[PDB]
Amino acid sequence: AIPRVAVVVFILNGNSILLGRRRSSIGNSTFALPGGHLEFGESFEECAAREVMEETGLKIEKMKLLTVTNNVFKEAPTPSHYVSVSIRAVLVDPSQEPKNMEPEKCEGWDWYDWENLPKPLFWPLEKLFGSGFNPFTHG
Template sequence: MAAPVPRVGVGVLLIKGEDEILVGQRKGSHGSGFYALPGGHLEFGESWEQCAVREVLEETGIELLESSVSFAAVNNNVMTTENKHYITIFMKAKVPPETEAQNMEPHKCEGWIWVKYTEVPKPAFMPLQQLLDTGFTLK
């Protein structure tokens, strides 16, 4: 049996106003019950920006332009109990104050909520919690 290999995930910080981000409670997969950003796996040949745009649309119905998405941070997530290893690339995009998210994948997410970046509900999914623990700011 081959050893597991790291995978690349992209998480998107959708920023509303000065300090609100969109999070959803995961369901039906690893991390079920944890709060996470919209995002998913980077597909072959895809840029980070393309992945962010695609995942946000698939999960929330929010349309982003690639030009509005930029790099925010990266972290290394080894989930030993689940035998998973991810490199998580965080992208960010500002959205208008009236932006609302739809739950496009109710089998994967309980629903989306806007929260202050410093008040992400617990428990936060490991990649997001690690980002918060680094002291990363939205500024």
């Protein structure tokens, strides 16, 4: 009945970000970022590191705020409204590789080059990229 807060993480690895196909009632099979719901009392940075750990096993650091998007899902089975806070981060150990830690929510994680992204993107992400957003150009 109310807008809910989610945190999504751009893990910047060379020229690539991490994406995985959703297993979900909303945006099923589309490519999306790791992340999830902000917990009460939790900071954006703690949420980003926690969700990434829980979903991918990756240890990330240097979390920085990117932007925020308003995602109203009208056609969902139960209508939902999410406010999506995006975070950029990098691996702690640069040799790390993801693991599909939550196979019920995701088909698997992989690195995709910014200029060879997969399709279809989860539509909030498609809309953000369509606006010209680029997580690599904020120093």
